[PDB]
Design a protein around this ligand. Structure first.
Ligand SMILES: Cc1cc2c3c(c1C)C(C)(C)C[C@@H](C(=O)Cc1ccccc1)N3c1c([nH]c(=O)[nH]c1=O)N2C[C@H](O)[C@H](O)[C@H](O)COP(=O)(O)O
Ligand SMILES: Cc1cc2c3c(c1C)C(C)(C)C[C@@H](C(=O)Cc1ccccc1)N3c1c([nH]c(=O)[nH]c1=O)N2C[C@H](O)[C@H](O)[C@H](O)COP(=O)(O)O
Ligand SMILES: [K+]
Ligand SMILES: [K+]
Ligand SMILES: [K+]
Ligand SMILES: [K+]
Ligand SMILES: [Mn+2]
Ligand SMILES: [Mn+2]
Lengths: 500, 500
């Protein structure tokens, strides 16, 4: 099976790439696996595969940390992401995001049902598992629970059967047969949960699949539109129908090669303690526990030698930056274009803790609009901040054609030198806010509303007659023949490899 | 003579440090020397010493580029700055800035007059030099003149003789015996020029000394208080009286070991075309020429084998970032402390193109003030933005004790995650603005007023009961004994030098 369609194959790809470290001596799921993974993430090291977890029982489970984190060299920086998508490991962020968007103007390819798969190799009923006895990791020292679910896919379906959503949302172990987790608006898991609540008749049929096809976990982390089944979008993207198997205890369908599958229900009435958790913006607020969604687990099925992927999230750089940030930026790029806005490119700079998106503008198109900063700012912000795709993003930075939005340094340069504080910004207080950002949930204002801004780093002539500067840098402040002479004589004069 | 007290000795120190490249083949002052220097600055390479300039006449002149720029390794990143100050090359920014501030609570050590020095080895009168025939550099391709003066010290004295100011301000060649330059408020050269204008009787006696004692060029680039003679402050800092010699044609005094000295007058009536120039924020606006201050040159004196230092300024990182930014931050730190504000540290992040200063707050002191964000923001901004030391700075970022303001990454993290846009900021529109910033001089608003902001990245509990988070990073989210075990086993498990 190819790496983009089978997690087990993806792990073997990372080995072959020399992008994996296999750790075959015992590692404690209480903190040590997550501490090793956190260090990997902070240093862009190789992904850790923990083949010997203390307390692993009945084949449950190995752990792979840092599945979507960055590689050290600039040449294949995004190579672990590329390997989720059948892209070359030297793929640029633009090429990854274009791949993730490519299904947005293709017909879906619905999934194929098969009678069995590797995910049915082993099973445990209600009387045979206990979630408190599995080697579930404690990820950060002050976490309020052991977060089993950091990189699996929740699968829920609308009551009418017309929409099946796949998404990542965190969950922790509550007791031997329940989890608690985040289920919050505007997320699709919440939108579907509301539908079942309003019908009022039963709990939501649910499954959580860990170690799913890498191309599926990428779509699971992207805000594709309301009502769009991720399976059919992944199908279209990959050009193949995904193979799914039916769960044993309900009628949902899971990827045939899933490593571990939990089957049960998401309650429409019950809650339980959840959190705190060390989160994407780089913080944990110890003691910050709240009531959350509660799940009941009725069955576990799993591959022989099952592997649990884990995100040890926090400060830069992990899956919550590379996937949440980038994939929201991609969806924002598309949204803007569908709303007739001249945006060519979007990215969430890591330096902003993925709370900003930089939008590159086609300023030729902009000039033809014959508009102003204030008008344009308002228009862009009204499109993005009233849409789900803008939920996690608090600052949009508009930049002209000379800025590469995939380079944080150049976004910071443009922000710092082209956007006059106050005058060149519009604040948005009556839009949904992202409460996880410390300045929202733990700040001075309402946790769920406002706090957003559009910062215009377009210069005045970019709206009228065209750019009227040159950069004071080596590239633009010297003629081409001089530049080349200097570069040709550089090491000869005594001054100091692309891959590395 | 020691390196901090003699430019020629400083160049020999850089050689010995293996922080110099001597280029003994011919280099064109039309662009090529500045292009090599710009590349050095963009890559943190060794400083270039051009010993063979095309068109060098009568011993005038060699060029040293990148005199105050950064070194490649993290260990001696600021080593070229340290060498201006008799500090070890591994000195931290905190230690450099503390050295620059140390004279602020010492009595001045006034300079010593000596009868001669190396700067009198050679002389040229009015009938013997022509500034248009010297190998003056064209620094950027669209510059409006050849900027002879990028790293020399202007010397002017109040009419009453009580204040002698030393400062850096740019100047370019106008004709055979005149320069034009920037002389703008609130700068001391402008403050003194105003005094002579109001007296109305004569042009301002002036000298411009190039290749001055490195400790003097550092003070020349710092906004020490109004009325304070830089020579006496440098004296106090270094613990020694500086040796000065009298100019031949006026009664000002120059450093005895200056490489090149121009003597003449700064006009109280005449102006001439100046600019454009590729500037500190990374731009040039071609064709943007304005009338500026005009200087007449009556005499040149110079050392045998004279060396002209040159800053090829623009995008990161050069003297306009390392010296303007850092030294303004230092003065701001002191100003805040003198105004009873609990600021421990200040730095202008390079990532902000030195348009921001991050102020580290002693939050124990802050709690004892029993204040609020809005009050505190206003107080800090009213102190800094109505003072000359705040002139170049458009955004102040307040951060708590856990942030190292000398690390841009940590300042960006705190800004992005702790300061809610709008709500946590106060805008300042009735303060002097820095017009060089593109969003000021070429922006949507008044070039000389407003555009400033105080951004509070203190969290709410930092004002009341204390920090209530831990970072979700390796350092803070794992116990000490685990951290050490992981680090001890890192290379054994298979994962990947301070100097490099
Ligand atoms: C890649 C990743 C993604 C998330 C999460 C984590 C990781 C690794 C973890 C589990 C490590 C962290 C956690 C977070 O704490 C971060 C977070 C992000 C957004 C909302 C809430 C929390 N999380 C998560 C998430 N969405 C959430 O609704 N609660 C979540 O718990 N997300 C984001 C979510 O998948 C995207 O918003 C998708 O668009 C949602 O799918 P649709 O609703 O559009 O179908
Ligand atoms: C290290 C350096 C510094 C400056 C300048 C450059 C370099 C290398 C050059 C020449 C390369 C660039 C140029 C600038 O274009 C940048 C600039 C900065 C601040 C004001 C105007 C321009 N410049 C300069 C500068 N001050 C200016 O009044 N016109 C100037 O021309 N400065 C700043 C100035 O020295 C400081 O503000 C001092 O505090 C002034 O001394 P006091 O007035 O307090 O005694
Ligand atoms: K999704
Ligand atoms: K702007
Ligand atoms: K000065
Ligand atoms: K704040
Ligand atoms: Mn969805
Ligand atoms: Mn001064």
């Amino acid at each position: 099976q190819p790496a983009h369609l089978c997690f087990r194959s993806f792990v073997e790809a990372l080995k072959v790439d020399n992008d994996l470290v296999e750790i075959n001596t015992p590692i404690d799921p209480n903190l040590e696996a997550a501490a090793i993974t956190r260090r990997v993430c902070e240093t862009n090291d190789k992904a850790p595969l923990f083949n010997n977890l203390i307390g692993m029982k009945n084949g449950l489970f190995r752990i792979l940390g840092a599945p979507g984190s960055l590689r050290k060299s600039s040449a294949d920086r995004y190579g672990r992401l590329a390997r989720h998508l059948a892209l070359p490991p030297t793929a640029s962020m633009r090429e990854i995001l274009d791949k993730m968007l490519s299904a947005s103007d293709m017909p879906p390819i619905p999934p194929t049902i098969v009678p069995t798969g590797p995910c049915k190799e082993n099973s445990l009923d209600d009387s045979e598992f206990d979630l408190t006895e599995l080697p579930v990791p404690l990820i950060h020292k002050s976490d309020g629970g052991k977060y089993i679910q950091t990189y699996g896919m929740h699968i829920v379906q609308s009551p009418d059967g017309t929409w099946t959503n796949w998404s990542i949302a965190r969950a922790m172990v509550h007791d031997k047969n329940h989890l608690t987790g985040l289920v919050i608006p505007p997320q699709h898991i919440w939108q579907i949960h509301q539908m079942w609540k309003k019908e009022g008749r039963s709990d939501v049929p649910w499954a959580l699949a860990f170690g799913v096809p890498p191309a599926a976990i990428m779509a699971s982390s992207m805000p594709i539109p309301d009502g769009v089944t991720e399976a059919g979008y992944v199908g279209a993207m990959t050009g193949s129908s995904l193979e799914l198997v039916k769960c044993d205890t309900n009628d949902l369908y899971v990827p045939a090669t899933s490593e571990i599958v939990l089957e049960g229900t998401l309650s429409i009435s019950e809650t339980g303690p959840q959190g705190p958790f060390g989160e994407m913006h780089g913080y944990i607020f110890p003691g910050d526990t709240h009531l959350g969604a509660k799940y009941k687990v009725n069955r576990i099925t799993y591959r022989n030698n099952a592997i649990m992927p884990m995100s040890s999230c926090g400060r830069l750089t992990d899956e919550t930056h590379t996937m949440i940030g980038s994939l929201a930026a991609a969806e924002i790029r598309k949204l803007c274009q569908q709303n007739d806005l001249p945006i060519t490119d979007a990215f969430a700079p890591f330096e902003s803790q993925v709370t900003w998106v930089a939008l590159r503008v086609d300023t030729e198109k902009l000039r033809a609009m014959k508009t102003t900063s204030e008008g344009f700012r308002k228009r862009v912000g009204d499109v993005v901040f009233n849409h789900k795709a803008g939920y996690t993003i608090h600052r949009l930075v508009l930049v002209g054609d000379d800025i590469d939005v995939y380079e944080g340094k150049d976004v910071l340069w443009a922000f710092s030198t082209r956007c006059r504080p106050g005058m060149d910004e519009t604040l948005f207080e009556d839009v949904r806010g992202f409460p996880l950002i410390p300045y929202m949930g733990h700040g001075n204002g309402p946790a769920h509303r406002g706090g957003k801004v559009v910062s215009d780093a377009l210069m005045p002539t970019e709206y009228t007659t065209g750019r009227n500067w040159e950069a004071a840098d080596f590239n633009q402040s010297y003629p081409e023949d001089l530049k080349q002479k200097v570069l040709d004589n550089w090491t000869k004069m005594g001054f100091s490899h692309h891959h590395h």
